[PDB]
Symmetry: C3
Subunit: 428 residues, 3 copies
């Protein structure tokens, strides 16, 4: 029930990634659609007709029946090739989005895993605080019923106890919600999860900022998709100028049609003009066409494409600045986490001394049990904060590496050494 | 004047809900234009033409004229029926989003209503604090004048007085802004509103979570949207496959023509071939075709449709998970509110006791008037907390009913029974 | 260096505003595309064909070789003019959004400047705090060595000293992040920024509320875009109606061809029908159309336009009420800022008095030096708070200027007169 076992199932259960995979497959398969028009196309054309002339052509009756096939093959029209180029670039963009989604899945699973354990720690602290506050109430009540204290003190103690009970209920609810959050990502209810092995924690140091900047510029996902968009805009510009290009097609058709002639006027002195015929047709030919003026429409589409391209370039520059600032922020965040870890470590070192000193006084008889319980609660506070700091450090390490774009699953030794014995998630 | 009346006015004065209704009307009307391509499509034409083509015929004049009608009526094609069905599904989707907008309107009205009472309470207690701090400053300045304290202590009192003045100004501004934001929903200014009846407030217990989950599965609007979208994807898959089947059409026409010539040379021994004519015809017939080979166009559409279908399935799974999570979170917020109510009740009792002790002590002469003012302020704030807790409980009950998918004016009515005390929205 | 220079550079460097300008330009270019169809058209259709008779119809052959130009020009169609009107409306919309973008840029530049200044002040305050805590730790350690306290006191002192070390590190990280986030807008590194001079700080009272609302309802941007949107919806209603109106167009052309034949079986009983011929055609004429019984294809298209228009009218009402609430809220915010500034000045004076008292006591020998350092820290905290309040006041005045719809660069020119003294961002 460590992070690796939870993420392996999350990979094959998460619908957010599955939708991304479906989108990528739709984008890829669509290319075959755009290559279809270039190939030849066949069709059938049977039909029927009936006519009845009037006005001058009075008393003329006729009926017709025909059926034929068609086949058109485009010889030279680059309009269809530019569609293929644009569609392959679209496929590239979709694949980049898929990579981004994969990294997101990893990060979200890790975050939920740590949130559960944080909830458990705060719950333990709240239980200790409740016990201390209850002992205080018992002491005050006994004093009052023997004297030495007014009723207002009793009511104040009751208020504090009710407040700690409310906090305990809130903590239980939060522990359930986080588990429910862990079931919403992975898709399974986990009763037991491993925790941090405190005795083997690593406060590593990060690389210089400039090296991270270079790696980011080289292999970041956002700016890569932005570059794909810029290339797509250039290709669209190339597609705009395709209008002036002439086009030609090669079409061939064949079919039969047997038409007979009748009528009182037709019969008699026909002269061979109205005799029936049973010829066929095997037409084959070409076709060529080219626009001359077109009122400058294409000369306007060309400028629209150029403006779109410059807009895309500005977008790319914005994305570049964004990635730079993000990498700097992540580096600073890691350093801040290191410093906070040191501070909390010293803080817990100090609180241990006081809880140790309160215990000895009770052993000899200078203090009371209430002091010991209060010191225990404070130390539990020093314990819950330190664990939170450690988890934040780990998540920030993952965050910087994700900004580099270089993490999919190489966080195998990163967390394997950070695991320990199972800890229950919903004790009863 | 009160909650029910405000909701009644907003039900017909709110522009967002009316825009939703307009969208519903647009969706339903769309069914008409999907039907239209089934009925006959009558038409009219009329065209004149002059021609002197003389590659070999120089001096020949031949004008032309025509005017005819048209009728077309499709017999067999499933490209139109699929469109009808898909438009019907879109209409259903629009209806569901309209219902969601209704529930959103109810929630927004309730929240805006309760914020005003919160502001009133805050304002009253801030004024009490201002009075207490002013009395403190008066005492300190008198004491400094008499020669018992240093100038440094006067500055502290003046600073505290200025701080409370600023807090009171902020409270008044927040009350004004909360009044304005409620007008942004109804379009009216409310001088007074009804307040909660403390002695007629109920504390119920929520139903078991399993029954809530069952009801949510039955009647959750987002899940209805998801299922309808998936059905719309399946029907679209059926539509794509129907691009294979053939089509049948029927056409008819009738018109006239003149095609009159002129010229002395044409007349005379023309053989009757070049004479003017006034022919007319009433041709009618059918038209049939069946595709044979279209390339990947036929093939690719089906695969793309199936990919979209699996995407819709993933989206539906996401909807299911989200619904379950939201139901549980609301169910737990309810109990959290109950516990907080208990705690704040105890706090109010404690503050009452402290105030009474202070008042008796001042009556017998053991305390100054300044001490009494502070206890009154502490009690007054304790009613800020308890008031803001009950409103949270009511809002949370409204939310949980919304998630269950059964939030109607009937549910909102049950709250108004506890609001039976008018109060001004602008003291003095 | 100064605010004016920073804005001057950001105006001509920022990529988002340049993208807005590019989008405006590309939108004004669509007007040309709208008119183009009205102007004439010209094309070519040269081609070739080869027939063949079979099934008892062999021996008959033909050869087609065609070439002809075509001119088409529409003389009456109201649908095209609707497109031009719609395009003009789109151009207006683009201009409006460009103006909004400029105003947003001004706001962001001012915000970044003041954020950097606030970071500098906070860094100074935290440095003073660190000095004070270090001296306190030294005192406690010396006392323990001399034998007046226990180890727990030293542990607490070390914890307190460790905490300030984390806070100092975080302040530098925030300062660097602010510098980078300013570079993201401007595009340059700024070692120094002009600082606020307190000798000439303005706290002018603002104008009444109703006057501001009336002026805003005239030259605001969001409601102007809403009005243009409703107008284009009406222009969209007009476009729909013109689908059932007749139209005319003109056609012209010319072409030649050669139609010689060859073959052995063709000879025999030709009867002049199998003779080679060359011919041309120069048809020119007008045309007309008018639809009837279309199954209400465009009839039901009109109802969709009207519902859309009422939706647009509803959105405009929403925009109106939103502007109302926004301007009122901004006014209240200005007033709150004034009050807060007064409070912070009083606090600063009180802290100064306390520091003077503490310093005099130390000079006469009744106080240690830890007290002096603590007083200094409190004074620096007060100074930081006051500076933040002043910056927020300036930002709020700019914000209300923006909400009014009258924000430019000359308005910001006045604020430059409040910034005199350069201050280093990262002093050595």
């Amino acid at each position: 029930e460590n992070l690796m076992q939870v993420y392996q199932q999350a990979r094959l259960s998460n619908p957010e990634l599955r939708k991304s995979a479906a989108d990528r497959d739709a984008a890829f398969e669509k290319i075959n659609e755009a290559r279809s028009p270039l190939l030849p196309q066949l069709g059938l054309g049977a039909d029927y007709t009936y006519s009845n002339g009037y006005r001058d052509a009075n008393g003329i009756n006729s009926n017709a029946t025909s059926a034929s096939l068609q086949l058109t093959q485009s010889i030279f029209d680059m309009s269809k090739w530019r569609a293929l180029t644009l569609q392959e670039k679209a496929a590239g963009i979709q694949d980049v989005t898929y990579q981004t989604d994969q990294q997101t899945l990893i990060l979200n699973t890790a975050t939920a895993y740590f949130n559960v354990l944080n909830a458990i720690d705060v719950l333990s602290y709240t239980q200790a605080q409740k016990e201390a506050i209850y002992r205080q109430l018992d002491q005050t009540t006994q004093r009052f019923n023997v004297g030495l204290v007014a009723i207002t003190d009793v009511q104040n103690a009751r208020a504090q106890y009710d407040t700690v009970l409310a906090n305990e209920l809130t903590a239980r609810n939060n522990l359930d919600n986080a588990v429910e959050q862990l079931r919403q990502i992975t898709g399974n209810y986990y009763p037991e999860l491993a925790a941090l092995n405190v005795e083997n924690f690593k406060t590593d140091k990060p690389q210089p900022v400039n090296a991270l900047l270079k790696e980011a510029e080289k292999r970041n996902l956002s700016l890569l998709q932005a570059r794909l968009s810029q290339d797509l805009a250039r290709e669209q510009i190339r597609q705009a100028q395709d209008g002036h290009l002439p086009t030609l097609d090669l079409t061939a058709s064949t079919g039969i049609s047997d038409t007979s002639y009748s009528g009182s006027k037709t019969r008699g002195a026909a002269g061979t003009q109205y005799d029936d015929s049973n010829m066929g047709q095997n037409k084959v030919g070409l076709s060529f066409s080219l626009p001359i003026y077109q009122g400058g429409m294409v000369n306007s589409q060309v400028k629209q494409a150029q403006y779109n391209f410059v807009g895309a370039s500005e977008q790319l520059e914005s994305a570049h600045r964004s990635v730079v600032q993000t990498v700097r922020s992540s580096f600073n965040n890691i350093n801040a986490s290191i410093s906070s870890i040191n501070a909390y470590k010293q803080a817990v070192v100090s609180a241990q001394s006081s809880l140790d000193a309160m215990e000895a006084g009770y052993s000899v008889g200078t203090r009371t049990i209430v002091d010991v319980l209060d010191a225990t609660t404070t130390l539990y506070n020093a314990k819950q904060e330190l664990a939170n700091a450690r988890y934040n450090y780990l998540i920030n390490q993952l965050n910087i590496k994700s900004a580099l774009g270089t993490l999919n699953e190489q966080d195998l030794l990163a967390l394997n050494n950070a695991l320990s014995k199972p800890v229950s998630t919903n004790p009863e």
